Amino acid sequence: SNQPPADASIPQDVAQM
Amino acid sequence: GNMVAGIPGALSNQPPADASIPQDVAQMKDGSV
Amino acid sequence: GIPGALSNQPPADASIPQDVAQM
Amino acid sequence: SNQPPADASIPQDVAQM
Amino acid sequence: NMVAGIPGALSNQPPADASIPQDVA
Amino acid sequence: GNMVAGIPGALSNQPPADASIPQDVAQMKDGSV
Amino acid sequence: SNQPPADASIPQDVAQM
Amino acid sequence: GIPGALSNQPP
Amino acid sequence: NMVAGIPGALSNQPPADASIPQDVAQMKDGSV
Amino acid sequence: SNQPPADASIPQDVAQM
Amino acid sequence: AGIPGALSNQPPADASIPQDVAQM
Amino acid sequence: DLQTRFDRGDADVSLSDVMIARNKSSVAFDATVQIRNKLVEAYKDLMNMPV
Amino acid sequence: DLQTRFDRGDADVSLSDVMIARNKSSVAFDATVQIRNKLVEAYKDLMNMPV
Amino acid sequence: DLQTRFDRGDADVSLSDVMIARNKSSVAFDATVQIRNKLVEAYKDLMNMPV
Amino acid sequence: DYSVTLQILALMTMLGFLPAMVILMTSFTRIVVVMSILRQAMGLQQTPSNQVIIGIALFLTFFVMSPVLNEINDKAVQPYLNEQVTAREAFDAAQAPMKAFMLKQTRIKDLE
Amino acid sequence: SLFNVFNVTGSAMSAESVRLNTTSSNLANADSVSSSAKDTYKARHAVFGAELSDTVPVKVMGIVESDKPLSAEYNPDHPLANEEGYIYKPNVNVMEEMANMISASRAYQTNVQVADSSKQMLLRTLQMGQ
Amino acid sequence: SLFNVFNVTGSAMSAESVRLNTTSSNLANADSVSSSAKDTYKARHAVFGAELSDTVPVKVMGIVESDKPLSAEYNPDHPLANEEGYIYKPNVNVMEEMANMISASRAYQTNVQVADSSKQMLLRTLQMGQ
Amino acid sequence: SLFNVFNVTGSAMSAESVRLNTTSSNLANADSVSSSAKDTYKARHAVFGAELSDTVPVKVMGIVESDKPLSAEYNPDHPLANEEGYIYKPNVNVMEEMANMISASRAYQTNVQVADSSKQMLLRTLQMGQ
Amino acid sequence: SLFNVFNVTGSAMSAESVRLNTTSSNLANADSVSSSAKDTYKARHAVFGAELSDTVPVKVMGIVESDKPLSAEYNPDHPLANEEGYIYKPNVNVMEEMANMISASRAYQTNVQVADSSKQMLLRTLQMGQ
Amino acid sequence: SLFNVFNVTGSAMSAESVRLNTTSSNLANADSVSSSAKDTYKARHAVFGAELSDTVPVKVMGIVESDKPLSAEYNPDHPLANEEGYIYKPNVNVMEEMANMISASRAYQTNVQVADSSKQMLLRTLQMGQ
Amino acid sequence: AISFDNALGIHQHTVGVRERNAEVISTNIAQANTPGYKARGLDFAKELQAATSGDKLYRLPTQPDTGDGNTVDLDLERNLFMQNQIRHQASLDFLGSKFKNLTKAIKGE
Amino acid sequence: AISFDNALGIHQHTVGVRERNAEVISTNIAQANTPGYKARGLDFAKELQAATDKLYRLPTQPDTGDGNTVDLDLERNLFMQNQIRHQASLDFLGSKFKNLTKAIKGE
């Protein structure tokens, strides 16, 4: 793809994000 | 600039809840700096 | 440059006014 | 470089120098 | 002018160990 | 079709008094069948 | 040899062999 | 011929 | 000449321990 | 050496060798 | 030479000086 | 013949026989070429001779 | 002779003797071919000269 | 000499020095062969000239 | 003395100079020229052909120079094969019989 | 131009060597309450960087200590104990330093493979046409 | 002739394997009073031999029993007891059999090393000149 | 040369074997009141020595007996008892033999590594020229 | 002149060979008490030198004994002890000998590659213009 | 088209890498009662697929949680205990995760052999005739 | 006198015989656990003579079988397979040089 | 001159001696357990003289009733040294013909 992949997010609560 | 950098190895490949990486280095990964 | 990076030179310290003063 | 690299110190106590 | 010394483990440790003879060092 | 047959391994290498191999199978060791 | 070796025998009594 | 060797044949 | 005997534990003993048969100990010198 | 070495003596009484 | 009290592997004879050891 | 039988997958063919057979063929054909070259060179020398 | 005795299974023939002899023969035969080429070229040089 | 000194069993000769010695001799002789071939080729070129 | 590898290279190289030695040291030169002159004498131009002219000269230069080859063989070839002489001495021992033959078959005026 | 590959793999191999030495110091100084001048050892970490704008060499841009707190131990009779009897020790964690030892070594060896493979490709280009 | 070496090492491994099976039969019969042949089992020991007179193979020239007396046990009610109530048992010694097991295994494995090392020498000779 | 390492390391392999056998005879004679040769066995020690004669091989210069006094035990009814009634036993110290057993085995195995290390260097030195 | 690299690489091979011989002697004489207290073996180490007055060869400038104090042991049983029952032992450290073994072997084999590759460059030079 | 072997072996290498990571997450979360998004994490498993309808690459079509019931632990004082005092834990079974660790690793390594062997055949094809 | 039989010698036949021996040894290793199987051996002198101018024997056991009737000494079979493999390669080097020597004589180079 | 005896040097004989030495060491290891066998050593200089013997090894330790004078620590080291030197002799003698062939063919 011509748009870089997004950095993964490892949250501890998901709700806060 | 447009340079991406940070601490490699086992320290980076952890959830950010560990907070074992300094915040200066942690933003540096993003690419803004 | 990276912030908080360590230096490869002895760490200017306290005793011996010599370091406390010279920049 | 034109100057030879300096030798390392590894001091036992930094204050002693 | 020469550059001489004991190679190996005896020189690759801090001088506080004091294994190399003074004259050689 | 002159073959030799039997259970390999531990069962056969016991002495015959153990009687672990079936007699029908044990008799195919001399070239019969 | 030219003649197949005979099978070893491990009897309980050498008399009935 | 080792004097007094065991044999390998039913006594 | 041919030299022979029992190897291992029995031979690696002092002669007083008569584990080795008498005639086999004779072979340990020389034979022909 | 040009001759075989002698064996080892393990006597229960050195007086009888 | 070297050690002063080395042993001798030859059986005792009391008549022949043991040459197995470095008798110097 | 052996190369075709071996390549087809025939069970009763050994690679040693195939290699022996093709090495004999290579030597024989090398002899045939060299002998032909010698005779042709001999022919050209005679025909180009000024009479 | 050394090759065929070792190859047939004779026990009192060492591979070193076999390899030493066959290396000698190769060098000897190589010299024979090279000397022949020098003589044949020398003969051709004298025969083909423009007299 | 270094090859036969190490081969006979002399303990004052190092395998490294022997390999160095035969490496240089092999390279030195290979240079000798190259110069010889060029000299002969020039002479063979020379003899095939109008005169 | 030169090493075995070098002295094999020496004889191999001069083995290719054998035609050179024949033309300017032995009796091959005189016979060919006389043969060529006589060929031009008759009306035939190349009837004897060059190869036949050379072939006769090669046989003649062997019969006539046979005493030269005899001395070279017994004085240079034989001592070298018996290890009675070295490479350089054997080569010098072969020059002397051939230098003597060439010296006696020349003209004083030309040498002067 | 495969010679650029040599620069990139060489820079990567240099970066892995720096990381390995940093791991070596952490393992050796994971139990040191003292220091050369005046400051307790803190787990060091090299910083890799990619100056993306061909090839992008990886360069080490400095050593940064870990931000984990120093592990306080109760050694009240120790000469260096504070007012509460606590002494502080480096925050080196064994598990992550062992992973760095494995990761740096395997990353170092695979860059040698690329350089060796890239070395062959240049050689075959020289032999092209003849 | 390094092929003669294979015979010596091969004969050695055969000799050591015979001793191991003899040791196996001793351990399995250290408590056997009866037997197929009506005679009490005696500890067996294969006899090695050397035909020294270059390569001298080691040969097994037969199994020879130990001459130590059978260990008598006072078992008066046993059906096989003699007039005085003693039953006789094999003279197998446990400690000496374990040493034979250790010795036979180690001697077996070291001959594999010689055979493997001698194999490399023959292959290296095939590369001579070529 | 690298072959001198084999002579030097090989000498240590034999040297540590001598000390192992001496220790074995010490452990087996720690409770032997009697002895052929009319001598109450005393603890023996193998004294190593550098034979300087770069490369310094190690040689056993002879076995030396212990200087500790024999352990006297009052056994009046023993046939070997003196007038006072004391029988004497060897001065073998178990703890030093176990320590010698460990040290001899550890030193023996580390000499194998040096011989193995020198072997690889010679093989690579031979690959040069091929 | 035509083989400058060989003289330097070869000198390293001879230099690193001496360091391995010295390491072998230190490990083989790590437990050689010998006699007295000044004739006791001491760890020896080669000294490398480079005269930079192109190529700078490496020359061994002699073997030098270590300055570490001798390892003292309390043993008033060894007949070669002293007044206080002490036997002084060689100042050989096993860990530093193992590191020297690793460093010497790898550095020795590295120069084999350079010397072997240097010959290839010389061979390719002979093919210039062909 | 022997290059299509690389598309198959490469896909298998990627497929077995996914299954190993899923096993890693299962082993690390076999004792985790809580979760960032709640839902009481259950053992995950990749789903392989073969689109058969020459070369059929293996493709992962997604991760599917195990259908095994969550393990219920009676911890009435735990904050997450329900009205009956139970808490729920992941259904990860140790014996089946260890088999997947062995199976995925060996399956990964055998696809390297096929890819490496297929690489050799292509090079020999390039050398056909030429 | 110039003929392949005279030029190739016995090496054109030895390779096939040692291949046969490898098959006989390999089937003994594979059938080591099959009870009632008697280890087979191939005489080299007889087989070579039969090949030169135009039936495997039984191998006697050094120790009795443990009740299965199989007389394969897997310790011995490995040793013979290793020896045959080395001698097979040596015959290949001998036979291979026979063709190369003929080619360089024919081509003069 | 120019003969195989001088072209090959003594490397033509050393390969044979290293094979004989390897055979003797193999015999010593195999006969280590057989009592009454005396370890045999080969004198290198003797086969050197034979080119231009089969001695006994005196033990460093006493026997244990077997009379066998084989030290397996010594034999392994002597077999390792002989095998390494045997390969070097092949390299030396092998290169004698490689240089010899290059001189004759000139290529």
DSSP readout, O60-99?
Answer: HHHHHTHHHHHHHIIIIIHHHHTTSS-HHHHHHHHHHHHH
Strands I3-5 and R71-74: unpaired
- From CA J7, how far away is CA I18, in angstroms rounded? 18
Cβ atoms S48, S107 nearer than 8 A = no
- From CA R7, how far away is CA R111, in angstroms rounded? 11
Query: In chain Q, which residue's Cα lies nearest the Cα of V81?
Result: Q117
CB contact under 8 A, U58 and G2: yes
- From CA O54, how far away is CA O31, in angstroms rounded? 9
- Is Q130 an 8 Å CB contact of chain U? yes
Name the residue among S21, S17, S13 with its Cα closest to residue S44: S21
The dihedral built from the CA positions of residue U25, U27, U33 and U38, taken in this order, carries a sign that is negative
Name the residue among Q105, Q125, Q123, Q127 with its Cα closest to residue Q115: Q123
Angle at Q36 between CA Q34 and CA Q40, to 5 degrees: 40
Cβ atoms Q68, I10 nearer than 8 A = no
- From CA F16, how far away is CA F13, in angstroms rounded? 8
CB contact under 8 A, R1 and N13: yes
Query: R120: part of which helix (H) or strand (E)?
Result: helix R94-127
CA E12 to chain centre: 8
Contacts with K6 from chain S: Cβ below 8 Å: none
Name the residue among T48, T64, T67 with its Cα closest to residue T8: T48
- From CA O47, how far away is CA O55, in angstroms rounded? 14
CB contact under 8 A, S10 and N30: no
Strand, coil or helix: what is P14? helix
Interface G-H: count of C-beta contacts within 8 A: 4
Angle at T61 between CA T56 and CA T65, to 5 degrees: 135
- From CA V74, how far away is CA R82, in angstroms rounded? 47
Query: In chain B, which residue's Cα lies nearest the Cα of P49?
Result: B5
Beta bridge pairs of residue P65: P44
Cβ atoms U4, U12 nearer than 8 A = yes
Contacts with S120 from chain N: Cβ below 8 Å: none
Residue S103, number of CB atoms within 10 A of its CB: 18
Query: In chain S, which residue's Cα lies nearest the Cα of K5?
Result: S79
For chain V, report the end-to-end CA distance as a whole number of angstroms: 23
- Is E14 an 8 Å CB contact of chain S? no
Chains B and V touch (3+ CB pairs under 8 A): no
CA U98 to chain Q, closest CA, distance in angstroms equals: 14
- From CA Q88, how far away is CA Q75, in angstroms rounded? 10
Contacts with M11 from chain Q: Cβ below 8 Å: 1, 3-4
- From CA P72, how far away is CA U82, in angstroms rounded? 65
Name the residue among S74, S117, S113, S66 with its Cα closest to residue S92: S66
CB contact under 8 A, D14 and C15: no
Residue N50, number of CB atoms within 10 A of its CB: 3
DSSP string across P98-123: HHHHHHHHHHHHHHHHHHHHHHHHHH
Cβ atoms P28, D3 nearer than 8 A = no
Strand, coil or helix: what is Q27? helix
The dihedral built from the CA positions of residue T61, T67, T73 and T78, taken in this order, carries a sign that is positive
Residue-level length of chain T: 130
- Is C17 an 8 Å CB contact of chain P? no
Read off the tokens for V98: 């490689």
- From CA M37, how far away is CA M49, in angstroms rounded? 18
Query: V40: part of which helix (H) or strand (E)?
Result: strand V40-41
- From CA T52, how far away is CA T65, in angstroms rounded? 25
Interface K-R: count of C-beta contacts within 8 A: 26
Residues ending a continuous segment of chain P before a break (C–N > 2.5 Å):
53
Chain L neighbours (≥3 Cβ pairs under 8 A) are: O, U
DSSP string across Q32-85: ----SSSS----EEEEEEE-------EEEEEEEE--SPPEEEE-TTSTT--TTS
CB contact under 8 A, V77 and R122: no
CB contact under 8 A, O36 and M51: yes
Out of V10, V95, V102, the one facing N8 most closely (by C-beta) is V10
Name the residue among M25, N28, O18, U103 with its Cα closest to residue V103: N28
Name the residue among R8, R66, R77, R74 with its Cα closest to residue R39: R66
Query: R88: part of which helix (H) or strand (E)?
Result: strand R86-89
Per-residue HEC secondary structure of N6-47 comes to HHHCCCCCCHHHHHHHHHHHHHHHHHHHHHHHHHHHHHHHHH
Residues ending a continuous segment of chain Q before a break (C–N > 2.5 Å):
53
Query: T51: part of which helix (H) or strand (E)?
Result: none
Query: In chain K, which residue's Cα lies nearest the Cα of J6?
Result: K10
DSSP state of E2: B
Please identify among residues 88-107 of chain S the ones whose CB lies closer than 8 Å to any CB of chain K: none
Name the residue among F30, U20, F25 with its Cα closest to residue G5: F30
Angle at P52 between CA P51 and CA P53, to 5 degrees: 115
- Is M28 an 8 Å CB contact of chain Q? no
- Is U40 an 8 Å CB contact of chain G? no
- Is V77 an 8 Å CB contact of chain Q? no
Cβ atoms U50, U42 nearer than 8 A = no
CA P98 to chain centre: 12
Amino acid letter, A9: S
Out of B15, B29, B30, the one facing A12 most closely (by C-beta) is B15
Residue S5, number of CB atoms within 10 A of its CB: 17
CA N42 to chain centre: 21
CA atoms within 13 A on the CB side of S117: 6
Cβ atoms R9, R119 nearer than 8 A = no
C-alpha torsion angle, residues O23, O25, O28, O33 (rounded to 10): 80
Beta bridge pairs of residue O11: none
Beta bridge pairs of residue R44: R65
Q: Which residue has the tokens 């062939």?
A: V101
Strands T71-74 and T58-65: unpaired
- From CA S6, how far away is CA M18, in angstroms rounded? 35
DSSP string across V41-75: E--HHHHHHHH---EEPPPSS--SSS-----HHHH
- From CA G5, how far away is CA T66, in angstroms rounded? 60
Cβ atoms T108, T17 nearer than 8 A = yes
- From CA L3, how far away is CA L26, in angstroms rounded? 14
- Is H1 an 8 Å CB contact of chain G? no
Cβ atoms T90, T42 nearer than 8 A = yes
- Rounded to 5 degrees, φ, ψ at S94 are -65, -40
DSSP state of F9: S
- From CA T107, how far away is CA T11, in angstroms rounded? 12
CB contact under 8 A, R126 and V61: no
Residue U87, number of CB atoms within 10 A of its CB: 20
Rg over CA atoms, chain D: 11
Burial class (CB in 10 A: 0-12, 13-18, 19+), L37: exposed
DSSP state of E16: G
Cβ atoms E20, E11 nearer than 8 A = yes
DSSP state of S95: H
Query: R94-113 as b/e, with b when 16 or more CB fall inside 10 Å?
Result: eebbeebbeebeebbebbee
CB contact under 8 A, J12 and R38: no
CA S112 to chain centre: 17
Burial class (CB in 10 A: 0-12, 13-18, 19+), R81: middle
- From CA P54, how far away is CA O34, in angstroms rounded? 80
Out of U10, U105, U109, the one facing M4 most closely (by C-beta) is U10
Question: What method was applied to determine this entry?
Answer: cryo-EM
DSSP string across S24-83: HHHHHTTT---SSSSSS---EEEEEEEB------EEEEEEEE--SPPEEEE-TTSTT--T
Which residues, other chains included, contact S3 with Cβ-Cβ below 8 Å and sequence gap of 6+? N23, N24, N27, S122
Contacts with M19 from chain Q: Cβ below 8 Å: 125-126, 128-129
CB contact under 8 A, R3 and V81: yes
Chains G and S touch (3+ CB pairs under 8 A): no
- From CA V11, how far away is CA V5, in angstroms rounded? 10
Interface M-Q: count of C-beta contacts within 8 A: 23
C-alpha torsion angle, residues M10, M15, M20, M22 (rounded to 10): 60
CA U84 to chain G, closest CA, distance in angstroms equals: 20
- From CA U40, how far away is CA U71, in angstroms rounded? 9
Contacts with F5 from chain G: Cβ below 8 Å: none
Contacts with U11 from chain M: Cβ below 8 Å: 3-4, 7
C-alpha torsion angle, residues U33, U38, U43, U46 (rounded to 10): -140
Cβ atoms P71, P89 nearer than 8 A = yes
Query: D1-17 as b/e, with b when 16 or more CB fall inside 10 Å?
Result: eeeeeeeeeeeeebeee
- From CA T47, how far away is CA L35, in angstroms rounded? 70
Beta bridge pairs of residue U58: U40
Cβ atoms V12, M20 nearer than 8 A = yes
- Is Q36 an 8 Å CB contact of chain G? yes
- From CA S83, how far away is CA A16, in angstroms rounded? 78
CA I10 to chain J, closest CA, distance in angstroms equals: 14
DSSP state of T49: E
- Is C4 an 8 Å CB contact of chain P? yes
Query: V64-82 as b/e, with b when 16 or more CB fall inside 10 Å?
Result: ebbbbbbbebbbbbbbbbb
Contacts with Q49 from chain I: Cβ below 8 Å: 2-4
Angle at U67 between CA U66 and CA U71, to 5 degrees: 65
Cβ atoms V57, V37 nearer than 8 A = no
Strand, coil or helix: what is Q104? helix
For chain Q, report the end-to-end CA distance as a whole number of angstroms: 20
- From CA I9, how far away is CA Q43, in angstroms rounded? 12
Cβ atoms M25, V102 nearer than 8 A = no
Residue-level length of chain E: 25
DSSP state of B7: -
C-alpha torsion angle, residues U76, U79, U85, U86 (rounded to 10): -150
- From CA V25, how far away is CA O46, in angstroms rounded? 79
Cβ atoms Q15, Q60 nearer than 8 A = yes
